[PDB]
Design an enzyme around this catalytic site. Structure first.
Site, PDB file in Angstrom:
ATOM      1  N   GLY A 104       0.810  -1.184   0.000  1.00  0.00           N
ATOM      2  CA  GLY A 104       0.000   0.000   0.000  1.00  0.00           C
ATOM      3  C   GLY A 104       0.850   1.243   0.000  1.00  0.00           C
ATOM      4  N   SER A 105       0.177   2.390   0.084  1.00  0.00           N
ATOM      5  CA  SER A 105       0.860   3.667  -0.130  1.00  0.00           C
ATOM      6  C   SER A 105       1.897   3.960   0.933  1.00  0.00           C
ATOM      7  CB  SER A 105      -0.200   4.819  -0.169  1.00  0.00           C
ATOM      8  OG  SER A 105      -1.116   4.584  -1.267  1.00  0.00           O
ATOM      9  N   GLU A 122      -4.587 -10.066   2.742  1.00  0.00           N
ATOM     10  CA  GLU A 122      -3.606 -10.180   3.817  1.00  0.00           C
ATOM     11  C   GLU A 122      -3.709 -11.453   4.656  1.00  0.00           C
ATOM     12  OE1 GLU A 122      -5.486  -7.490   3.003  1.00  0.00           O
ATOM     13  OE2 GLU A 122      -4.015  -5.896   2.553  1.00  0.00           O
ATOM     14  N   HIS A 179      -0.358  -3.248   4.753  1.00  0.00           N
ATOM     15  CA  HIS A 179      -0.739  -1.862   4.651  1.00  0.00           C
ATOM     16  C   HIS A 179      -1.585  -1.402   5.851  1.00  0.00           C
ATOM     17  CE1 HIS A 179      -2.085   1.923   3.393  1.00  0.00           C
ATOM     18  NE2 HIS A 179      -3.355   1.570   3.558  1.00  0.00           N
TER      19      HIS A 179
HETATM   20  C1  LIG Z   1      -6.668  -3.877   2.735  1.00  0.00           C
HETATM   21  C2  LIG Z   1      -5.785  -3.063   1.851  1.00  0.00           C
HETATM   22  N1  LIG Z   1      -4.659  -3.601   1.327  1.00  0.00           N
HETATM   23  C3  LIG Z   1      -3.906  -2.858   0.479  1.00  0.00           C
HETATM   24  C4  LIG Z   1      -4.213  -1.568   0.211  1.00  0.00           C
HETATM   25  C5  LIG Z   1      -3.399  -0.729  -0.720  1.00  0.00           C
HETATM   26  N2  LIG Z   1      -4.072  -0.353  -1.947  1.00  0.00           N
HETATM   27  C6  LIG Z   1      -4.064  -1.127  -3.161  1.00  0.00           C
HETATM   28  C7  LIG Z   1      -3.531  -2.502  -3.189  1.00  0.00           C
HETATM   29  C8  LIG Z   1      -4.681  -0.386  -4.221  1.00  0.00           C
HETATM   30  C9  LIG Z   1      -4.794  -0.831  -5.613  1.00  0.00           C
HETATM   31  C10 LIG Z   1      -6.152  -1.338  -5.991  1.00  0.00           C
HETATM   32  O1  LIG Z   1      -6.109  -1.729  -7.361  1.00  0.00           O
HETATM   33  P1  LIG Z   1      -7.416  -1.804  -8.229  1.00  0.00           P
HETATM   34  O2  LIG Z   1      -7.090  -2.694  -9.395  1.00  0.00           O
HETATM   35  O3  LIG Z   1      -8.578  -2.201  -7.425  1.00  0.00           O
HETATM   36  O4  LIG Z   1      -7.683  -0.327  -8.750  1.00  0.00           O
HETATM   37  P2  LIG Z   1      -6.711   0.721  -9.530  1.00  0.00           P
HETATM   38  O5  LIG Z   1      -5.947  -0.080 -10.562  1.00  0.00           O
HETATM   39  O6  LIG Z   1      -7.685   1.678 -10.177  1.00  0.00           O
HETATM   40  O7  LIG Z   1      -5.854   1.370  -8.476  1.00  0.00           O
HETATM   41  S1  LIG Z   1      -5.236   1.131  -3.690  1.00  0.00           S
HETATM   42  C11 LIG Z   1      -4.645   0.957  -2.118  1.00  0.00           C
HETATM   43  O8  LIG Z   1      -4.672   1.827  -1.169  1.00  0.00           O
HETATM   44  C12 LIG Z   1      -5.265  -1.017   0.950  1.00  0.00           C
HETATM   45  N3  LIG Z   1      -5.540   0.332   0.911  1.00  0.00           N
HETATM   46  N4  LIG Z   1      -6.074  -1.756   1.708  1.00  0.00           N
END
Ligand SMILES: Cc1ncc(Cn2c(C)c(CCOP(=O)(O)OP(=O)(O)O)sc2=O)c(N)n1
Ligand SMILES: Cc1ncc(Cn2c(C)c(CCOP(=O)(O)OP(=O)(O)O)sc2=O)c(N)n1
Ligand SMILES: Cc1ncc(Cn2c(C)c(CCOP(=O)(O)OP(=O)(O)O)sc2=O)c(N)n1
Ligand SMILES: [Ca+2]
Ligand SMILES: [Ca+2]
Ligand SMILES: [Ca+2]
Ligand SMILES: [Ca+2]
Ligand SMILES: [Ca+2]
Ligand SMILES: [Ca+2]
Ligand code: NA
Lengths: 525, 525, 525
Positions: free
Chosen positions: B24-25, B46, B69
């Site tokens: 995560g970020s 996770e 994260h």
């Molecule tokens: C439970 C959890 N794990 C990991 C993350 C980190 N995370 C992750 C892994 C993201 C990417 C999601 O990808 P997506 O394919 O759903 O959408 P985009 O490609 O549009 O970002 S956005 C984000 O904050 C998180 N916020 N919450």
């Protein structure tokens, strides 16, 4: 009466009729002899259970009741509780404990130090000291979840308690009515109203507790009277305002300097039902520019205490919005001008731009659709491109925790059987709570799931660019067939590789009689 | 040096070379510039991340390093941490926090009160007070996870810390060696040995910490010298003894009265590396019968304190087993007689009895196979029917939390590339951590997954029968196509509706070059 | 600006000008360069520090600021925090931490896991993640202590933070105004008022939050309009009503059955500013009799949730009392008749009956005296025998924790320099916080301390009789010379062995210019 009978009576007398659960051994003595007037909604993993319950509670604006298994089941739900804490979701989380006679030895399935397990993500967390206390503890849980600021609570119950005799005095619990529907005293409310009436260039910022309170229409009246632009506070979990109303100005950027620049020139900024503020990126600068003062109305003392600027009032959002809307003067200023429509992005006959997807959804979906968002790199475009006229039309994971939207969309659809729910979920996010699809299939809850498949964790690539971070592992998620996952759990599935197929897939989904998943091939970032 | 560089140096100097994660970020500043000598194992949720890491740590007998994260990611892993706590798994769980400058405002992605979140399921939980402390905090985490009794630990790190300058004195951390490899003092050890030598009818009970210590062979020598029958302590997370050795007597029933009846007539019962005891069903009666005394050797003070009977010694299991095996006399009693083979159950040409499945696995699998069990109604039959000659051959969710075996089997297979891993998982249990399949596909980790599909939560039907509980909802899980789920995540899949197809499917799986899932139609209970 | 300068500016801008403290090494960087406009009140032990601050906050109806040393100093104050939690006292408790660079090694004076130390007795507990956050954390602490329901909060600050540069944006903290002065919405308030107007035989019960809000006069108007008898809720920490007003009916017995019997025949019972209820003895029976319904107005969600009966409204007590008093109808019922005076107990020329002491105090003390009670076996007689006409006239340890009244009486006297404070404290209770006497001497705070010396823990003998418990050790406290203790700490001291000497001693004390302790020989129970 038994503790079992007394507790189900309390629950039904307090309006609870549904148990969202994944069962275990410690819970069988609670679930047995399940009452005919209740319904049990099974999900296959506890993040899914709680996500479904959370969507149901948020859309129904009432508490949802959950039953999980001991520590492992509670633990599997903890990420879902992260989101529920930041959305103020009224969730009554119960978990079964071992029989009192083996708690000490720590038999298998003992939840050790149970009340500390879900902390710090609950308002109240408890395991009763005796069986006869269980109804009274359940009463506490109901009211703690339901009073402002609403939020999740936790109750652990030893399995042997249910068959014990209840206290005859527990009947006094059944019809208790507890209110937090409060507003600022008249003298101070008049001072606030005069400040709003006197403002030369007011602005309004709204957060999720407006939508939770169904204060949306009152906030429209308030904005029209004050002739004021309206934004949504950053990292928005809900939509508190009609997005094509002339006063609407969209989702605020989640940065300190960006917000103070946006508010520059506004003398009074009234924030209602939001933290001040849910920033994300670090964008240091002034919290407010000279000339701007801020007043926050919040249902949550913790939000009022931690705001870095402004005055605050801690009160019920529904009661305050109604009072302000009805008391302010109609300003002689001109009503703000509606924002223009977004432009059409150029789209060839290949993979879909997200902007095309949202424009097409807006074209095809009913006017009373409900959207959920876990397509994390496309949120700004979503907010620009969907006309959401009605309350309860948008949900996004309030803590930023992936795994909310897929199950929550099922709970929302259960709460709102006559409004079509459309969950727009990235390929990454879809996996966290994928098994929730099964509950939609089994109960025929007709949610539409739109999977935005670009092969990567796009929002993480965005943040890596903000950080100028290179050589990061783990950002790509190739090789997932979402139609096969949907088939695995009994949900009809479609694929859209281009715009023609997206339109066709949406037409089929909108006329289907059950849940449908559409895998959309979207452009790689 | 930066905190980033110093921390990866500490990790590699302490033997850590793999990061199990879901990014995560807040974690991107840690993961960036990822070192070439490390490898990153992505999982999609996770619970899966931690389950994989847990199997890896248990099989490799060394700590595993995890990166999650913030609060939502940590929370999604909490059920997996339940199991890791009860298996004493040495897991270093790290999670990223918001930048220090916005922790106060509770920006999106802030992990509030972070150290309390995974409590009470960790040995140590911490967020450092400054960036320069991070390496020293990581050192604490490494050693706390690794010292007896091993277990999971948690470290939260603000994302801005990684680029700050490290303390030049952090180099003293890199090569620290910390030992807990201790045994009872000579005088008291001699007293214990004399008690064992003097016993007229000793019995030995072994738990999971024997297998964790690789004390299995020493325990064989001890049992042969003492001429003593050997059981496995109830609710067994691991297999501590060769299951066809003549002294072996199988898995103990998980009840108080059942165990005291089993031990009746044994004058001294030596328990090694187990809690006393992980009972499940309530089966009240005597903890021990008159004439039996109990001595426990445990690596965990908490186990020694909570035993309801017996003496205890808190020491390292490897060191104690070695010392006892080498010091006791060879008794002149006759060696126990091996248990007879289990009988073949009658099997027609339709759905498979679980006993048939286990007999067929035992016939076809390599002698050094490793099994995992999350087929919760069939555990007793599994234990009777699989000849497990070697250490590290069996894992079962130590807290009883479903969702362990599927991911853990991937981690075990990663740890033991030359031993074929075969995870036997019920249709119910398979869903909790289904997305872990993707990691097996992506990294080509050749685990075999055998899904025992009977359509129901069979173990819950068993416990409902023990309770005489009727009208329980939520016990059936119809309508899941496991071959489609496997296809969804890129894993080759087979189905076995009868014995002919089971044999064919196993032959194909055993000669495959990647992971394989076999859906087995088993008899309904 | 430094963190030091910025934090003192925040404090003074938020109305704080006094630091109650006992210093240590970690606190010297905070206390240095102490501002000229502040004053520091030293006490010799931390229970005394917090008790003094607590009395000051309760009497001044504003937050009090405390500074203690690390874990040991915080820990010494924890019993005082027990009382402050149950009185809703707005206490800002700060403690110094080790320098950030040695927190990890756990140098001497490190407060390990600091925020968990005062839990569960604080509303908010925190240690900032960086020096620049300290002002913002202090702002949170101020507002968390001050918002309804008021209560103690805890902030731990590493000593090196004070000299660091502050964030220039901290100025936005200085003038924040946060309000919780809220009342029930008009529609629901009208429903409540109609219910009160319609009642045939209403009763009113008042608790400590009435006195904290200075809602006393409004409650008098309300009781006069409704023509209703008024009691004080059991285990009363404050006096919310004039004790000779015709409606007053005294202190409720602290038992379930006793209260329902007392309320029998009252159709509507309105509870304001109390838990429902602070029972003590177990006196099982009906919570309310048939025919009685209860409505509670409370500032504390936790009180509303845990009441075993009745409806509840969570709102500010001052705002609600004012609104109700002004909205209800004047009933045509006859005003209740004042309770008759208590009888004089027979008194010979020897040791004093407590009733004689209270009658004599009532005869001699000014009409605006303030009393504190820690003479635990004589509370009922005290309540019957002291005419307390004015608000802020009575304090009793809200958690029942001895050691409150002696220090609190000093803080109250500091808050109310023109009202003579008279603390009536048993010989047992006097010891818990005896060193607080020194602060009265040093600062010449002219509290009068009346020590009721009967040689025993009389209230424990009472409870032992309720339990029919025999052969209890530790109940007698012979051999304490309270005049010598007072001399030890510089306080003028007198002894009264009979009524003549009690009158003479009180006359001398009332005309003294500093604190005075009177040791009274009272009858043994
Ligand atoms: C439970 C959890 N794990 C990991 C993350 C980190 N995370 C992750 C892994 C993201 C990417 C999601 O990808 P997506 O394919 O759903 O959408 P985009 O490609 O549009 O970002 S956005 C984000 O904050 C998180 N916020 N919450
Ligand atoms: C995380 C979690 N949730 C729920 C349970 C309860 N549970 C459940 C749901 C079981 C049934 C598993 O069904 P299966 O299909 O995997 O195997 P059987 O049919 O052989 O029982 S066994 C058991 O203890 C649990 N222990 N842990
Ligand atoms: C901190 C603390 N310790 C012990 C007690 C127990 N305790 C004690 C020791 C009491 C006796 C106080 O004796 P006293 O001389 O002050 O007054 P009486 O003789 O009138 O009871 S009342 C009571 O609850 C307590 N409540 N709080
Ligand atoms: Ca029905
Ligand atoms: Ca994506
Ligand atoms: Ca490499
Ligand atoms: Ca099954
Ligand atoms: Ca001065
Ligand atoms: Ca006494
Ligand atoms: Na926790």
């Amino acid at each position: 009466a038994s503790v079992h009978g007394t507790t189900y009576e309390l629950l039904r007398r307090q309006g609870i009729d549904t148990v969202f659960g994944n069962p275990g051994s410690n819970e069988l003595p609670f679930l047995k002899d399940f009452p005919e007037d209740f319904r049990y909604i099974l999900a296959l993993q506890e993040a899914c259970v709680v996500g479904i319950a959370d969507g149901y509670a948020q859309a129904s604006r009432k508490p949802a009741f959950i039953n999980l298994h001991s520590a492992a089941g509670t633990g599997n739900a903890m990420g879902a509780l992260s989101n529920a804490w930041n959305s103020h979701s009224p969730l009554i989380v119960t978990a079964g404990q071992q029989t009192r006679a083996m708690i000490g030895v720590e038999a298998l399935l003992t939840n050790v130090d149970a009340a500390n397990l879900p902390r710090p993500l609950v308002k109240w967390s408890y395991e009763p000291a005796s069986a006869a206390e269980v109804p009274h503890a359940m009463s506490r849980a109901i009211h703690m979840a339901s009073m402002a600021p609403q939020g999740p609570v936790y109750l652990s119950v030893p399995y042997d308690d249910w068959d014990k005799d209840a206290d005859p005095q527990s009947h006094h619990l059944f019809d208790r009515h507890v209110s937090s529907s409060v507003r600022l005293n008249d003298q101070d409310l008049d001072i606030l109203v005069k400040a709003l009436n006197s403002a030369s260039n007011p602005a309004i910022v709204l957060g999720p507790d407006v939508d939770a309170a169904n204060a949306n229409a009152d906030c429209v009246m308030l904005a029209e009277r004050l002739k004021a632009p309206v934004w949504v506070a950053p990292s928005a979990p809900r939509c508190p305002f009609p997005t094509r109303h002339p006063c609407f100005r969209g989702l605020m950027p989640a940065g300190i300097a960006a917000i103070s620049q946006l508010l520059e020139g506004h003398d009074v900024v009234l924030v209602i039902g939001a933290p001040v503020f849910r920033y994300h990126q670090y964008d240091p600068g002034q919290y407010l520019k000279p000339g701007t003062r801020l007043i926050s109305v919040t249902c949550d003392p913790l939000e009022a205490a931690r705001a870095p600027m402004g005055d605050a009032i801690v009160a019920d959002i529904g009661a305050m919005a109604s009072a302000l809307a009805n008391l302010v003067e109609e300003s002689s200023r001109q009503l703000p001008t509606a924002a223009p429509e977004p432009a059409k992005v150029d789209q060839d006959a290949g993979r879909l731009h997200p902007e095309t997807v949202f424009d097409t959804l807006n074209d095809m979906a009913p006017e009373n659709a409900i959207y959920l968002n876990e397509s994390t790199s496309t949120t700004a475009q979503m907010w620009q491109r969907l006309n959401m006229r009605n309350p309860g039309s948008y949900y996004f994971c309030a803590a930023g925790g992936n795994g909310f939207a897929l199950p929550a969309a099922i709970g929302v659809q259960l709460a709102e059987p006559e409004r079509q729910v459309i969950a727009v979920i990235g390929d990454g996010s879809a996996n966290y709570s994928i098994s929730a699809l099964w509950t939609a299939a089994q109960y025929n809850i007709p949610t539409i799931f739109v999977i935005m498949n670009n092969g990567t964790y796009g929002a993480l690539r965005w943040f890596a660019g903000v950080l100028e971070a290179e050589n990061v592992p783990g950002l790509d998620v190739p090789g997932i067939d979402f139609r096969a996952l949907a088939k695995g759990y009994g949900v009809q599935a479609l694929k859209a590789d281009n715009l023609e197929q997206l339109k066709g897939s949406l037409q089929e989904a909108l006329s289907a009689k059950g849940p449908v998943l559409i895998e959309v091939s979207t452009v790689s970032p």
